[PDB]
Amino acid sequence: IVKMEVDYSATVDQRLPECAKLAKEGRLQEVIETLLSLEKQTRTASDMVSTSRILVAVVKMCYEAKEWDLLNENIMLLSKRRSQLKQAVAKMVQQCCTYVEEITDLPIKLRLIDTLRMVTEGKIYVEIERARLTKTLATIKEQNGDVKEAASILQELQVETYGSMEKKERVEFILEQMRLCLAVKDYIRTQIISKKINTKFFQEENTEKLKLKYYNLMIQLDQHEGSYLSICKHYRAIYDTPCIQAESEKWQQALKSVVLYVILAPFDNEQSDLVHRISGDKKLEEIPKYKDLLKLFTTMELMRWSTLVEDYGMELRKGSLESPATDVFGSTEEGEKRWKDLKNRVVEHNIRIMAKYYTRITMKRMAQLLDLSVDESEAFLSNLVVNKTIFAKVDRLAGIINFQRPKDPNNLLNDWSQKLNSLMSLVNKTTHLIAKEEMIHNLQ
Amino acid sequence: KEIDGRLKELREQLKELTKQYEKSENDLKALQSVGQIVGEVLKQLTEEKFIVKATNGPRYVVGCRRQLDKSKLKPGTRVALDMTTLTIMRYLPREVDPLVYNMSHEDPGNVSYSEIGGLSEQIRELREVIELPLTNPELFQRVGIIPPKGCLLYGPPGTGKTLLARAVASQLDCNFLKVVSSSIVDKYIGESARLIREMFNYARDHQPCIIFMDEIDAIGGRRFSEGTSADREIQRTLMELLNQMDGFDTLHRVKMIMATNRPDTLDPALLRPGRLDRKIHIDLPNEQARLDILKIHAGPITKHGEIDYEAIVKLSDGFNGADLRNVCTEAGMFAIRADHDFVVQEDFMKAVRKVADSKKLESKLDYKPV
Amino acid sequence: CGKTMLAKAVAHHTTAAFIRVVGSEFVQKYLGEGPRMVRDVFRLAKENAPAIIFIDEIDAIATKRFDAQT
Amino acid sequence: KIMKSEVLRVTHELQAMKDKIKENSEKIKVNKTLPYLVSNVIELLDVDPGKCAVIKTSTRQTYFLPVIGLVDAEKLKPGDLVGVNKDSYLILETLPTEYDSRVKAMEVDERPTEQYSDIGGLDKQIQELVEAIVLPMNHKEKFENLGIQPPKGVLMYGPPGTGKTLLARACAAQTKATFLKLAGPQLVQMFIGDGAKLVRDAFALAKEKAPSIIFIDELDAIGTKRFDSEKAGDREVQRTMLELLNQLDGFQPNTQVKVIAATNRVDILDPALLRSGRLDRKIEFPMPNEEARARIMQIHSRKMNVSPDVNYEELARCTDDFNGAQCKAVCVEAGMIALRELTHEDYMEGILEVQ
Amino acid sequence: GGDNEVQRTMLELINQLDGFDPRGNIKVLMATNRPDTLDPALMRPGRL
C-alpha cells in the first residue's frame, strides 16, 4: 500500500523470542506494551511484515498463556488503534481463526463474536472474508442449530457470494445455511435465497452430493404451501443424477416420486408435455408406476379414485421400495393433505375429460362420477369456470349443463360451406380415381 | 498398382477443382439475372397496396401477388421491386454498416487484460459496468435501477487505453463495435448522420453491443465563433449524436466507452451526468507498476540474474509503459552491438540514461486533470 | 420549463390534436415532398379544428439567417 | 482395376469444366469490361434462410444483387470503386479505389535516385537508421525468423540543412520500395477532418503500394508540446495527431511501411508520439563539423571540374555553424561565379547573401 | 485556414517547377518587389 521506510527485521528477530521467554506465562503486560511501541514504530515506518509478525506473536502469547478475557480487549485494541496495516490485521484474524477451532471451551462463542465484531467494521470483500464465513459457520456449530444464528448466516452470505465465491466452498456454505433456514421453517426468505442462488448452475455436471442436497432441501420448501409442478421438475432433475451414477434404490424411488408428482400436478399444457415426455421411458417399465402412468395419463379414462386406491393404490401399502410413496401418501397429516390433493386432482381431470366427450350430462351422473354430492360437484364446477379452463353453462334449477359454445349463424354456414367444398373436392378426387381405374380395368 | 495409383492422382487434382461449370452457370445466371430495384416501404396503402420509396427515386406503390406474406411486411421494410413485374418478388431484411463492420470486426489477436499492471481498479470498473448488468439482472431488479451507461478515460497519452480497448474487444470479438470517430467526414453532405443512425440501429438489433469510440475531442469542441461550414457540420453532427444516444428513446444493454486527451475542451453538454455516468482518470504508472510493466516487457529477453530493477525504478520516473519497451528495445540493439547473445545490466543502464536524456527535452508531459 | 409540457398539456386541457413535427427530421432528402408534407399536416390540422401544430429545433437547422446558404 | 475409366472422365471433366468459365468469364468479363456504376457497398450479411449487398450506382440508383454473385466479401470489403454490372446489376470485380483527391498524388515520388554516397557527416546516425529501416526491408525475413518485429517510427530531429530529406529518400531508394512524402506544415486544414482524411489515405496508399516509407516532415508543426494557452490550444490539430497515432499500429503485422518524421526540435512534442511501438528511434541531426562540412561540399562539387587542387581547408575554417544545405549553397555559389575566387576564395559570400 | 488555397497552389507549383530531371531547355523567372516568399525560399537555393 505504502512504501516501507525503516525496517526492524533485525530488532524483532533479536527481541521477540526473548520477550516470549520473559513472559512465558504472560503475567507481564509491559512486554505487550513494548512490542506495541515497536510495531507502532514499524507502522509509522510503513512496514507490513514486521507488524504482522508482531501481531501473530502477540496472539500466540495469548494462546499459550490462555488469558481469554485479556485476549478480547487486546485484539480489540489492536484492531481499533489506528487500523494499522490491512495485511497485518487480516493475518492476525487468520491465526485467530486457526486457533478458535481447536479448543472447544465455553467462551469460544465469545471469541467467535469478538472477532466477528472486529471484522464487521467493514473491509469484508477486501482483506479476507472467508474467515468471517468460517466464524459464522463455527457459531452455527456451537449453538447446534437455532433461529438467531440461522438468520445471522442468512444476512452474511450475500456480500462474499457476489464478491469472491468458490465453486465448491461457497456453494456448500449456501447449502449449509438454507438447511438451517428450512429448520427455522421460514418460507418467504428461504424461497428468496433459494431462487437467488439457483441461478448459478452449470457446475452440477460434476456434482457428487451437492445438486441432490440442494434439491432435497428445496423439495420441502416448495411442497409445503402449494407447489406441485416445480416438484416434478426437480424430482426428475434428481432422477437424471442416478443416470450417471447407477444406484438402484435411489433411482427407482426417484422414478416413483416423479411419476406420482407429474400426474398429481394441476392440468396445464406444460404438464401434458412432461407426462408425454416421461411416458415411453425404457427404464420405467419394470415398476408398477409404469402401469399407473399409462392408465392415468391419456385416453380420458374414468379416474374413479375409489377404484384407483386398490387398482393402482398398492404403492401405499407395499411396492418395490414404497419409500417415496410412504413419504407422499403414507404420512398422517401431510399425507392426508396429499390424499385430498389426489382426491380433487382426479375430479378436475374427470371434469376436463368429460368436457371434451359429453355435451350435456345429468347432475346425478356427474356427481356420481366425481364421487361427491350435487353441491360439491357444482362447487368444483364453479372452480373450473372461474379459471377459464372449461366453457360450461349450467341451469341450476334444472341441474343441466352444456359445454358447446352457441354457434353464430355466420360461422355455422361457413363450416357448412367448408363441408360442401370438402364434398366437392371428394367428388373430384373420386371421379378421377374411378375413371382411371375404369381405364385400367377395361384394358382387355 | 499402375492401374491403381495413377487413379489416386487425377481425381484429387479436381474435387475442389473441376468446380467451374456451375460457377460458369451461376455467373451466366447472373448474366440473365434480373436486377430488382430496391426501396423502403414507407407505409401500407391497403392490404394489397404498399407505398414504397426508392432509395433514390420517387415513391412507387407495389402489391404482393399471391404469397409474399404481406402481413410480415412493415412500414420501413426492405423489398425488391421491378419496374416491369409490377410487384414484390421477394423480401430482404436490412443493413449493417459494412465499412464500420469490418473495421469493428478486425480486432487483432491481443493479450489478456491481466497483462497490464497498475490498473486493477480500472479493470474492476470495466467489469462492474459491462459484465455485472448482464450476468445478474436479478440483484439490480431487487435494487430496481437501470445500469449505468458509459465511462470516460483520460490522462497522459500513454496509459494503456488502446491496450484496454483492444483487450475488451478481444474478449468478445463478435458483438464489439470499434469507432475511430474521424471517418465521419466524407465528400458528400450526406452519409454523415445516416451512418451514425445506422450502427445505433445495429446496436438496437443486438442488445449486448459494446461501443468504443476514441477522441471525442475530434467532434466535441467548446464553442465555434464565426463558424465555418465545416464547423457547422460538427455541431449538427454532435447534436444528432446527442439526440440519438440520449434523445427521447434510450438504448438498452448498450455501453459507450470513450477516451480523449483534452478533457477541458470537451463540450459541457455531453459530459453532464446522464450521458457520461462515470469519469475515470488513468494516472501516471506507479513505481512498482512500472516495475511490473518492465518485467512484462523483459519477459522473452535473454538475461541473467544481476539486473538492478530498483535502480531503474529510482532513475526512471514519470515514464509510462511506453518508455519501458523503449528501454527494453534500446537494450536490445545495444545487445546487437558487439554481437552479445545475452543482455547485460549495463545495456539497461545505457537505455535508461538515453531515454532519460531523451525525455529531458519535452515539457508539459500531461494535461492537468479536471 | 420543458417547452413542450404546455403542448402536451393544453391539447388535453381542451381536447385537441398534438403533433411533434420535429424540424430536425424534416430537413432531409425529402425536400421535394417537404412542401407536400406541410400540405398534408396542414390538412390533418384543418381536418380537426381542435388541433395544435408544435414544431421543434428550428434554431440550429431550420432557416438560420446569419450564416450563408450551404 | 478402375483408373482408365476414372481419368477419361477426370481429364475430360477437368478441361470441359474450365472451358465454360473461360466462356463464362468472357461473358462476364466483357461486362467486367463494361462496368458503369460505383459500388457504395451498404452490406447485409444476408444468410440465406450467406451475404448480400446494396450498390449506390453512379446514376443514383440502388441494386441489391443477391449474395454477391461474383466476388467474395472477404476481398470485397466495403468502400467504393468495385466493379458492378451495368446490365446484370451485380458486383463484377475489385478495382483500385480513389486516394482522397490530394493523396492520389500529393508529392509522391515513384522512385528516388539520390544515393547514400552523396550524403555524409552523420555516418554513425545514418547507419543506425539504415539498420532500423533499410534492413527491415531487404532482410525482412531475418527479423521474421529471429522473432523480433522491427520498430517503424524513426524521428529524425535536427536543425534544417542536416540532410534528413536526402537520407530518407536515399534509404527509400536502397530499399527499392515505394516512397511517400508528406508536406507536414501544410496538413493543418480548415476543413474538418481533412488532415485526418489525408493521413488515412496516405497510410492506405502506403499499405496498398509495397512496404513504403512515410516521410512526414515538420513533426513539431504536427504535434504541439501541449503548452496550452488560449491563444492556441492545439485543438483542431490534436484531431490529426491522434489520427496519426492510431494508424501507427495499422501495419504492426508483417511489419511494412515505416514512418520517418523529420523536425528540428524534438522537445516540442508531448509524450504521445515518443512511444516504443510508435515513433521510437529518435536520431540527432547536428550541424556538421569543419571536416564533415568540407567533405559534404567537396562531394557536392565533385561534379564540378573548374578549379583543381582545392583542399577546402580555408573553407572549413570559414564554414562556422553552417548546415549541409548552406555548404551546398556555398559550393553552388562557386558554381555560379566560376566562369571565365575560383580556388579557395569563391565560397564565403554564399552565406552572406542569404542575410 | 485564412489562405489555404494559396497553400494548395504552393504544393502543386513546387511539384511542377521542381525540375525532377535537370533540363537546360525550359527556364523559370520569378519577379516581385519585396522578398516575401514562403518557406520554399530555402529549398529554392537548390531550385531558384
Ligand SMILES: Nc1ncnc2c1ncn2[C@@H]1O[C@H](COP(=O)(O)OP(=O)(O)O)[C@@H](O)[C@H]1O
Ligand atoms: N500500463 C501498461 N502496461 C503495459 N504496457 C504499456 C502500458 N502502458 C503503455 N504500454 C505500452 O504502450 C503501448 C500501447 O500504447 P497505449 O499507451 O495503450 O496507447 P494509449 O495510451 O493512447 O491507449 C504498448 O506497446 C505497451 O507495451
Ligand SMILES: Nc1ncnc2c1ncn2[C@@H]1O[C@H](COP(=O)(O)OP(=O)(O)O)[C@@H](O)[C@H]1O
Ligand atoms: N550530408 C549532406 N550531404 C549532401 N547534401 C546535404 C547534406 N545535408 C544537407 N544537404 C543539403 O541540404 C538540403 C536539404 O535541406 P533540408 O531537407 O531543408 O534540411 P533538413 O533535412 O536538415 O531539414 C539538400 O538540398 C542538400 O543539398
